[PDB]
Amino acid sequence: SKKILIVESDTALSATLRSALEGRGFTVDETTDGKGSVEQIRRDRPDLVVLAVDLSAGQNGYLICGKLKKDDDLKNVPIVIIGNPDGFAQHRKLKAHADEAVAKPVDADQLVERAGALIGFP
């Protein structure tokens, strides 16, 4: 099994991305709750996280990414950020950063290809 968690408060986008990944054979869960996502990942470990920058409630995805990538037990989980590419180069400068980053508006097919490249197609 290849398990993905989508952390995204845009529920329409999340459903489309979930469906594309599911069609390709991934198991996918979704959460809009950025605050709860790190502990959700700890207790229900996915193979990959798709993480939006623009989260509701003043959260941002690069911060959630940093929390994951600073945790020695969770840092090995690959993360694909989805958001405005104007932030991607700066994020590459951090010690703790996402494995990859894909622009919004998201090309769903390309996101699926990156998932497969990162964790294997199931």
Numbering used by the authors: 2 to 123
Which passages does the manuscript contain on this structure?
The Myxococcus xanthus FrzS protein transits from pole-to-pole within the cell, accumulating at the pole that defines the direction of movement in social (S) motility. The N-terminal receiver domain (RD), a 258-residue coiled-coil domain, and the extreme C-terminal tail of the protein are all required for the dynamic subcellular localization and S-motility activity of FrzS. Here we show using atomic-resolution crystallography and NMR that the FrzS receiver domain (RD) displays the conserved switch Tyr102 in an unusual conformation, lacks the conserved Asp phosphorylation site, and fails to bind Mg2+ or the phosphoryl analogue, Mg2+·BeF3. The crystal structures of the mutants suggested that the observed conformation of Tyr102 in the wild-type FrzS RD is not sufficient for function. These results support the model that FrzS contains a novel ‘pseudo-receiver domain’ whose function requires recognition of the RD output face but not Asp phosphorylation.
We tested the functional importance of Tyr102 by mutating this residue to an alanine in FrzS-GFP and examining the social motility phenotype of the resulting strain. M. xanthus expressing FrzS-GFP Tyr102Ala failed to undergo normal colony expansion in the S-motility assay. Western blotting analysis showed equal levels of FrzS-GFP Tyr102Ala and wild-type FrzS-GFP in vivo, indicating that the phenotype of the Frz Tyr102Ala variant was not the result of decreased levels of the mutant protein. As these cells move forward over the agar surface, Tyr102Ala FrzS-GFP localizes primarily to the lagging cell pole in a manner highly reminiscent of FrzSΔRec-GFP. The Tyr102Ala mutant crystallized in similar conditions and in the same hexagonal space group as the high-resolution wild-type form. Similarly, no large rearrangements were seen in response to the loss of side-chain volume in the Tyr102Ala mutant. The overall Cα RMSD for the Tyr102Ala and wild-type RD structures was 0.23 Å. In response to this mutation, His92 switched to a more common rotamer that does not present Nδ1 to residue 102 for hydrogen bonding. There were no major structural rearrangements along the α4-β5-α5 face, and the all-atom RMSD for this area was low (0.43 Å). The close similarity of the Tyr102Ala and wild-type RD structures coupled with the loss of S-motility of the mutant suggests that the Tyr102 side chain plays a direct role in FrzS function.
